[PDB]
Amino acid sequence: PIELLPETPSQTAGPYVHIGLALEAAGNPTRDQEIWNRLAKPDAPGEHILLLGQVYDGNGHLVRDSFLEVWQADANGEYQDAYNLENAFNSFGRTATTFDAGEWTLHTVKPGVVNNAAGVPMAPHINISLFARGINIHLHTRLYFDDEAQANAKCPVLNLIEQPQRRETLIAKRCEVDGKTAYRFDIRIQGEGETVFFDF
Amino acid sequence: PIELLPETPSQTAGPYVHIGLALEAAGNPTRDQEIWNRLAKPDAPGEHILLLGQVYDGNGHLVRDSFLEVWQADANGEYQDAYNLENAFNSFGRTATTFDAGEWTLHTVKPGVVNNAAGVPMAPHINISLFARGINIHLHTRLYFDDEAQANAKCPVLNLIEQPQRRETLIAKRCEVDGKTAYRFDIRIQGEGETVFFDF
Amino acid sequence: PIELLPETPSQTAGPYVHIGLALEAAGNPTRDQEIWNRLAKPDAPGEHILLLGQVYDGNGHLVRDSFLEVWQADANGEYQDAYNLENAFNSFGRTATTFDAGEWTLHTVKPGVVNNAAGVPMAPHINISLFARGINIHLHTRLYFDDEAQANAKCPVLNLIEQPQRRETLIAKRCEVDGKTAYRFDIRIQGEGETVFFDF
Amino acid sequence: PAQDNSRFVIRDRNWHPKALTPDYKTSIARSPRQALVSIPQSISETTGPNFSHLGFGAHDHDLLLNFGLPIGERIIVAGRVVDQYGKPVPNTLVEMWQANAGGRYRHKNDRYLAPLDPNFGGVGRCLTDSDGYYSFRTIKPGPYPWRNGPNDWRPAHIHFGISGPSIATKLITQLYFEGDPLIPMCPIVKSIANPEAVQQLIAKLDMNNANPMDCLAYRFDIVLRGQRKTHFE
Amino acid sequence: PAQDNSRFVIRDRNWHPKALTPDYKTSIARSPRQALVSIPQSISETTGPNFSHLGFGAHDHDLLLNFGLPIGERIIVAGRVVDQYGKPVPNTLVEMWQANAGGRYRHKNDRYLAPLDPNFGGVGRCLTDSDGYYSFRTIKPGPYPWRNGPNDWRPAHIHFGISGPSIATKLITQLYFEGDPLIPMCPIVKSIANPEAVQQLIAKLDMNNANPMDCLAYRFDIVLRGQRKTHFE
Amino acid sequence: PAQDNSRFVIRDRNWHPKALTPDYKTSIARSPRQALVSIPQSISETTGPNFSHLGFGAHDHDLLLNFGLPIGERIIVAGRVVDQYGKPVPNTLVEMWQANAGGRYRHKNDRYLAPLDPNFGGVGRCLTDSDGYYSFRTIKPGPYPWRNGPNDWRPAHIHFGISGPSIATKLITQLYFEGDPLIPMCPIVKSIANPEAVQQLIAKLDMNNANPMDCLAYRFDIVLRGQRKTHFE
Ligand SMILES: O=C(O)c1cc[n+]([O-])c(O)c1
Ligand SMILES: O=C(O)c1cc[n+]([O-])c(O)c1
Ligand SMILES: O=C(O)c1cc[n+]([O-])c(O)c1
Ligand SMILES: [C-]#N
Ligand SMILES: [C-]#N
Ligand SMILES: [C-]#N
Ligand SMILES: [Fe+3]
Ligand SMILES: [Fe+3]
Ligand SMILES: [Fe+3]
């Protein structure tokens, strides 16, 4: 059979990820430009929401050194790849859990619908990559919204998860934080209610 | 030491086991003679019962593609190996879980007592072999009856199970189905209340 | 790098460890001098205590063939290494769980405070080593007292345990047996509430 | 009726694939977490059905006829069923099943885009003869994509089931074809740790049994647990 | 916006470190027990951010100046980012971080007794050029004692993050230095089962890129998942 | 009392058997799932009991006299206890236990059909000498069938317990006899991943220590964790 060059092996981000990717958190001085948790400027089209959650390990303990990366379409269902701090909206963001509460937050807009390779629309979703110490290779997941029940039912991606009960793990819970629309999305790395992780 | 020819390695039955061993279920035309789930004809001596149950995976999810084979003594506690559709009773049978409900059923007679190699009587039991996708090598178990409490306490096999609590995983629970004597026997492949499996 | 001689590898104590280390328990005649569960003679200085507990496996089943060894300082926080049946106090002891009840007991005195290599004091503790069938290499643990709460919160050792919930697994729960001060210390080898085991 | 006169060589559980083989995704949730409980062989375990009187159809073992002529590589799959002592297992039940030439299964749950074959069913059965020989006639199945890793494909394979003298001997396995490049990538194949065990599942091209100008042939021998008489029991 | 034009070669999860690697204690409780669910690549997975327009500071890639001169081994760390097909990855974001020369990190949580360097921050970032080349200037970090086994020490290493063309290619890894005796001992290194994969993480001394009487250099090429066009989809 | 003057070389947990070795069935439920918590050595860990004043009986180390003459192969089991630095461990406690000639233990729970030996207990103890030498006189134990797989037999072995200078060095192990074919088949033995480690458990035939026309002798050296003085602490 044919073999290509082998992909560089992954390694855990380490407990100090922050010094390199979340300067603020590391408690270090930031640079002029930093990739952070505000995907949308107040004047961005779409329904402005706040995302928040906690990360749990196999023992039910909080993972307080987790680092997350998000990728999502705009309100129009379009991926804005040209990253720029000037943009009103950026499809890409970064966040991390507080060493205290151990909660991550993201400021964005509800993503519009996008179709799969085969022309089928996927329910609004946020693509998440989780990194942290004790994680050798980052974990891929998707955040779906509980108020998109209809779309969710028909999602070609969600539908690949054999057990319906496991699908539920990918659904963020609508709530209000300071009177602002928010969705809570906790990640259970291992055990009971373990979140679905994807390979692609 | 001495070595014989190595036995041919097992392999999972696969999801489509039905095409081969449960024609009907596969939704395919059957042949004139098929090995199925009715071990006893109405005119067979012994107590006619109905066996039923579900199979669960480690997550508590139904295993809808399981394939089971049973082996039991006749009412006299005699193994009838000469398989024939003409017999009023056959010691061998096959069943499978519905793709829907995920339940299997068997039509037979309560087996008579049989003695171990050492001359001690075993409680009435049904030998069961489980097969399915994800199962590399089939699992062996035994179905004992709850109404044979006195017998069960003294069974040399049941007594081999170190932990008394584990013994109960092997006992089918008596009830009635359409006014018929039935026993429900659920197999839990993994986790909480995991069914005892044997090696012989 | 530099390599030394490799230490001889460990093996499980086996089910019949009593024959060798717990003569009585084996139901065999003892010798003139035996190493047993009475560290303190009734007239030894300090607060006399009775310790007892059970040992559970990952299934929550009692481990009835367990064998434990203890090492603690005297009431003055001193390790009496010169073992002698004559001494009023021995720092070293041995015990084992009952083939029936499956409970172990130890008769001693509450240990005094010892400092770590850095000079910081450790809460009063008993060093435990657990052996048994199914245990390839003995497990090390520490027994702390629920009534030394103040000390405990500052122990450099206890503090090394990352998750606060796990620290609780090391705390003996005070009580009274026959009007005597008793501390119950259960060991959960595996699973829910698994006791912290150490390496040194 | 059946009698407890035999004993069976104890299975080598390191030879056979273990229960938990993580690359074969399904195995994770379908493997027991508790150790199997060993039990002495008794009449219960040392006996099993005899299919001597099962009423087999004329083309039970001929997949070319038992369902027009199927499209695909016309082959004969034959061999012998012996025990570990090299003793032949006569009049034993051999059942096989498979996908068509395109790797499509004639099963409800098969959503693969390769088409069905109007003249192909994919089921065969026969009894070993007095010498422990069996033979089937079919077409060579195609590889099949499956949802395991994102690009996994089962090697071309034929599912087999063999009864043997007792339930202690009953086995379900898979035949693979000599030289199939997919063999070594399959997580199902790989559930077997010993490469030597893997070799036993490989049917060999058998020119000597082929019908010139007609159909090739593959040879696949099966070894069931050795049977011995009880002694000094 | 971005478009679904590419497909990325499936990851080799037997090459990358597995999830559960017991010697690396933290992995115990931080690894899924359920199997990863395989999904087809879509626009969501085949696109990612382009950092072409990010405003990079003049010394973003120069740890010697981006935070007095730091004490320690002056080195240049350079190399090229290519995909599995050997195709260069132009204008991609490379980010790195490390400890100082004594093995101390400029991070809240680091309690290691080696002192911080007043002239050293430890963070760098840069975009690869048209030929997929990158380069950083720093000091060689020292080994780091950590609480794993009782005497565990991380080999001198630099943390790296590489974007690539899609989130499908995004990678976080670590670089090690040619000949460091600690490497073969590291439980983190050992999470990787293939010694051949291990070799991919070792930066090689590069005398040709060194600045005589100034600083030495290390070569570290990174390979991202191969990018191919879709066909017959 | 005892003083914290020593440090003990860290244990190599890849040398010793791991906790979870599923073939040894019982290890399944008796192995922790959480990782061990590493702690620095304190006086608590670096001290242990001194058995110099224990009142040993005269025949404590002579299993032939300490319980008629036992039936079985008369042997002397002797060797030396040293640390990893090769330093002898004087006056340390060595205890041994074993079954009789037929593989029968004198214990309540042993229901093996082989009879007990009226003149045999199966327990011995002694203190190493100035040179770290120990010696027992006993009979060669017989193999024992046990409820693991359906046909598991423990190789003939002798259980050993060694105190060493501290609780940090205390060890329990098993001695096996040179050339016994059951050795490589045992799941308990196979709990040890390194064949080289396995080798340290085999007592070698020692004709030089044998008593002509009387008994054979086996040599079994024991190696405890290396002891060194503290430095720059
Ligand atoms: O995973 C960890 O615990 C760890 C600790 C320290 N360093 O330097 C790392 O890179 C990783
Ligand atoms: O175990 C499975 O999932 C599987 C899928 C498809 N085929 O063809 C098999 O043989 C096995
Ligand atoms: O762990 C066991 O079950 C076991 C049984 C018998 N012997 O002799 C041992 O040494 C160990
Ligand atoms: C390294 N963190
Ligand atoms: C394949 N079934
Ligand atoms: C040994 N038991
Ligand atoms: Fe690091
Ligand atoms: Fe198949
Ligand atoms: Fe033993």
mmCIF file of C-alpha atoms in Angstrom, chain E residues 24-183:
data_model
loop_
_atom_site.group_PDB
_atom_site.id
_atom_site.type_symbol
_atom_site.label_atom_id
_atom_site.label_comp_id
_atom_site.label_asym_id
_atom_site.label_seq_id
_atom_site.Cartn_x
_atom_site.Cartn_y
_atom_site.Cartn_z
ATOM 1 C CA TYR E 24 1.581 9.769 32.823
ATOM 2 C CA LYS E 25 -0.770 9.825 35.840
ATOM 3 C CA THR E 26 -2.829 12.850 34.856
ATOM 4 C CA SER E 27 -3.957 10.972 31.708
ATOM 5 C CA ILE E 28 -5.829 8.483 33.914
ATOM 6 C CA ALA E 29 -8.713 10.726 34.849
ATOM 7 C CA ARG E 30 -8.384 12.901 31.729
ATOM 8 C CA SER E 31 -9.132 10.355 28.999
ATOM 9 C CA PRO E 32 -12.522 9.335 27.545
ATOM 10 C CA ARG E 33 -13.562 5.702 28.109
ATOM 11 C CA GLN E 34 -16.033 5.861 25.198
ATOM 12 C CA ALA E 35 -14.709 5.462 21.603
ATOM 13 C CA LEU E 36 -14.184 8.622 19.471
ATOM 14 C CA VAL E 37 -17.175 8.930 17.052
ATOM 15 C CA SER E 38 -15.937 9.094 13.445
ATOM 16 C CA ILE E 39 -17.539 11.720 11.214
ATOM 17 C CA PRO E 40 -17.142 12.724 7.542
ATOM 18 C CA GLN E 41 -15.190 15.929 6.822
ATOM 19 C CA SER E 42 -17.435 18.943 6.087
ATOM 20 C CA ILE E 43 -16.855 22.682 5.744
ATOM 21 C CA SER E 44 -16.755 22.916 9.557
ATOM 22 C CA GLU E 45 -13.737 20.601 9.722
ATOM 23 C CA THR E 46 -11.999 21.442 6.441
ATOM 24 C CA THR E 47 -11.615 25.204 7.028
ATOM 25 C CA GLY E 48 -9.811 27.214 9.733
ATOM 26 C CA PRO E 49 -8.504 30.694 10.489
ATOM 27 C CA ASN E 50 -5.907 32.501 8.438
ATOM 28 C CA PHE E 51 -3.585 34.715 10.513
ATOM 29 C CA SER E 52 -2.108 36.661 7.593
ATOM 30 C CA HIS E 53 -3.665 39.882 8.878
ATOM 31 C CA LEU E 54 -2.805 39.501 12.568
ATOM 32 C CA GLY E 55 -0.624 42.366 13.785
ATOM 33 C CA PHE E 56 2.679 40.781 14.845
ATOM 34 C CA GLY E 57 5.118 42.778 16.995
ATOM 35 C CA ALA E 58 8.652 43.236 15.643
ATOM 36 C CA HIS E 59 10.095 40.864 18.237
ATOM 37 C CA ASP E 60 7.233 38.345 18.359
ATOM 38 C CA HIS E 61 9.632 35.595 17.267
ATOM 39 C CA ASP E 62 12.658 36.867 19.208
ATOM 40 C CA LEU E 63 12.575 35.672 22.844
ATOM 41 C CA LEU E 64 15.974 37.263 23.265
ATOM 42 C CA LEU E 65 14.329 40.691 23.021
ATOM 43 C CA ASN E 66 10.561 40.324 23.405
ATOM 44 C CA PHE E 67 10.379 40.513 27.214
ATOM 45 C CA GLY E 68 18.788 43.030 29.430
ATOM 46 C CA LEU E 69 19.772 39.822 27.678
ATOM 47 C CA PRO E 70 18.592 36.495 29.103
ATOM 48 C CA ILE E 71 21.185 34.152 30.592
ATOM 49 C CA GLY E 72 21.448 30.734 28.850
ATOM 50 C CA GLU E 73 22.291 29.010 25.571
ATOM 51 C CA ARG E 74 21.612 31.290 22.652
ATOM 52 C CA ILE E 75 19.914 29.299 19.931
ATOM 53 C CA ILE E 76 17.901 29.728 16.812
ATOM 54 C CA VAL E 77 15.092 27.187 16.299
ATOM 55 C CA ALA E 78 14.073 27.000 12.615
ATOM 56 C CA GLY E 79 12.457 24.540 10.249
ATOM 57 C CA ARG E 80 9.720 24.108 7.720
ATOM 58 C CA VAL E 81 6.073 23.169 7.892
ATOM 59 C CA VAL E 82 4.976 20.763 5.212
ATOM 60 C CA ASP E 83 1.969 18.464 4.861
ATOM 61 C CA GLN E 84 2.145 14.699 4.416
ATOM 62 C CA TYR E 85 2.557 15.108 0.624
ATOM 63 C CA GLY E 86 5.642 17.279 1.152
ATOM 64 C CA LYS E 87 3.752 20.462 0.248
ATOM 65 C CA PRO E 88 4.823 23.564 2.134
ATOM 66 C CA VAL E 89 2.314 25.349 4.414
ATOM 67 C CA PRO E 90 2.779 29.073 3.774
ATOM 68 C CA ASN E 91 1.564 31.819 6.076
ATOM 69 C CA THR E 92 0.592 29.488 8.957
ATOM 70 C CA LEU E 93 0.687 30.379 12.644
ATOM 71 C CA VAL E 94 3.456 28.844 14.720
ATOM 72 C CA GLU E 95 3.406 29.624 18.462
ATOM 73 C CA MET E 96 5.857 28.397 21.075
ATOM 74 C CA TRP E 97 6.558 28.694 24.783
ATOM 75 C CA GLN E 98 9.108 27.311 27.207
ATOM 76 C CA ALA E 99 10.846 27.606 30.562
ATOM 77 C CA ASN E 100 14.043 29.585 31.172
ATOM 78 C CA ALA E 101 17.546 28.131 31.199
ATOM 79 C CA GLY E 102 17.123 26.762 34.754
ATOM 80 C CA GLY E 103 13.798 25.073 33.986
ATOM 81 C CA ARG E 104 11.546 27.780 35.466
ATOM 82 C CA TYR E 105 8.322 28.929 33.769
ATOM 83 C CA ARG E 106 7.023 32.497 33.999
ATOM 84 C CA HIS E 107 3.669 31.177 35.202
ATOM 85 C CA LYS E 108 1.750 31.685 38.438
ATOM 86 C CA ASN E 109 1.418 27.984 39.110
ATOM 87 C CA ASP E 110 5.128 27.152 38.756
ATOM 88 C CA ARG E 111 6.603 26.650 42.215
ATOM 89 C CA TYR E 112 9.939 25.245 41.068
ATOM 90 C CA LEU E 113 12.826 26.695 43.039
ATOM 91 C CA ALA E 114 14.965 27.683 40.002
ATOM 92 C CA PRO E 115 14.833 31.482 39.712
ATOM 93 C CA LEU E 116 13.043 33.466 37.020
ATOM 94 C CA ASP E 117 15.201 35.417 34.533
ATOM 95 C CA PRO E 118 14.388 39.133 34.633
ATOM 96 C CA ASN E 119 15.077 39.360 30.866
ATOM 97 C CA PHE E 120 13.069 36.291 29.841
ATOM 98 C CA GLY E 121 9.383 35.806 29.119
ATOM 99 C CA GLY E 122 9.262 32.505 27.198
ATOM 100 C CA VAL E 123 6.610 33.163 24.537
ATOM 101 C CA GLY E 124 7.151 33.443 20.767
ATOM 102 C CA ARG E 125 5.005 33.445 17.645
ATOM 103 C CA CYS E 126 5.466 33.862 13.925
ATOM 104 C CA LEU E 127 3.926 33.129 10.552
ATOM 105 C CA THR E 128 5.620 30.712 8.126
ATOM 106 C CA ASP E 129 6.843 32.278 4.862
ATOM 107 C CA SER E 130 5.941 31.318 1.310
ATOM 108 C CA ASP E 131 8.176 28.262 1.507
ATOM 109 C CA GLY E 132 6.693 27.184 4.815
ATOM 110 C CA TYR E 133 9.775 28.260 6.781
ATOM 111 C CA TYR E 134 9.732 29.669 10.306
ATOM 112 C CA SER E 135 12.379 30.681 12.791
ATOM 113 C CA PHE E 136 12.580 31.789 16.385
ATOM 114 C CA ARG E 137 15.491 32.984 18.504
ATOM 115 C CA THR E 138 15.678 31.997 22.165
ATOM 116 C CA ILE E 139 17.664 30.258 24.874
ATOM 117 C CA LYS E 140 17.701 26.471 25.396
ATOM 118 C CA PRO E 141 15.313 25.697 28.292
ATOM 119 C CA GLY E 142 16.399 23.432 31.175
ATOM 120 C CA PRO E 143 14.815 20.152 32.349
ATOM 121 C CA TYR E 144 11.843 20.490 34.753
ATOM 122 C CA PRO E 145 11.100 18.378 37.842
ATOM 123 C CA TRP E 146 7.389 17.474 38.074
ATOM 124 C CA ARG E 147 5.106 15.467 40.350
ATOM 125 C CA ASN E 148 4.421 12.265 38.409
ATOM 126 C CA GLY E 149 6.578 9.440 39.827
ATOM 127 C CA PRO E 150 8.800 10.530 42.768
ATOM 128 C CA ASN E 151 11.827 11.467 40.607
ATOM 129 C CA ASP E 152 10.330 12.473 37.192
ATOM 130 C CA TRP E 153 12.135 15.166 35.130
ATOM 131 C CA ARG E 154 10.895 16.564 31.769
ATOM 132 C CA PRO E 155 13.593 16.684 29.084
ATOM 133 C CA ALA E 156 14.472 20.255 28.010
ATOM 134 C CA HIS E 157 11.519 21.009 25.675
ATOM 135 C CA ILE E 158 9.731 23.796 23.867
ATOM 136 C CA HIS E 159 5.947 23.712 23.478
ATOM 137 C CA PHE E 160 4.633 24.327 19.945
ATOM 138 C CA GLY E 161 1.213 25.075 18.456
ATOM 139 C CA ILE E 162 0.624 25.058 14.679
ATOM 140 C CA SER E 163 -2.564 26.096 12.960
ATOM 141 C CA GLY E 164 -2.289 24.776 9.429
ATOM 142 C CA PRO E 165 -5.047 25.313 6.879
ATOM 143 C CA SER E 166 -7.885 23.863 8.921
ATOM 144 C CA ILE E 167 -8.945 23.067 12.462
ATOM 145 C CA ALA E 168 -8.458 19.526 11.120
ATOM 146 C CA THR E 169 -4.707 20.148 10.929
ATOM 147 C CA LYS E 170 -4.297 22.180 14.121
ATOM 148 C CA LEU E 171 -1.623 20.620 16.304
ATOM 149 C CA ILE E 172 -0.039 21.039 19.670
ATOM 150 C CA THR E 173 3.204 19.168 20.373
ATOM 151 C CA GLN E 174 6.643 19.499 21.980
ATOM 152 C CA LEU E 175 10.200 19.674 20.626
ATOM 153 C CA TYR E 176 13.092 17.877 22.341
ATOM 154 C CA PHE E 177 16.834 18.293 21.874
ATOM 155 C CA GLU E 178 19.042 15.829 20.049
ATOM 156 C CA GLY E 179 20.818 13.511 22.465
ATOM 157 C CA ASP E 180 19.107 14.561 25.734
ATOM 158 C CA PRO E 181 19.448 11.562 28.096
ATOM 159 C CA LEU E 182 16.090 12.372 29.777
ATOM 160 C CA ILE E 183 14.006 11.673 26.658
#
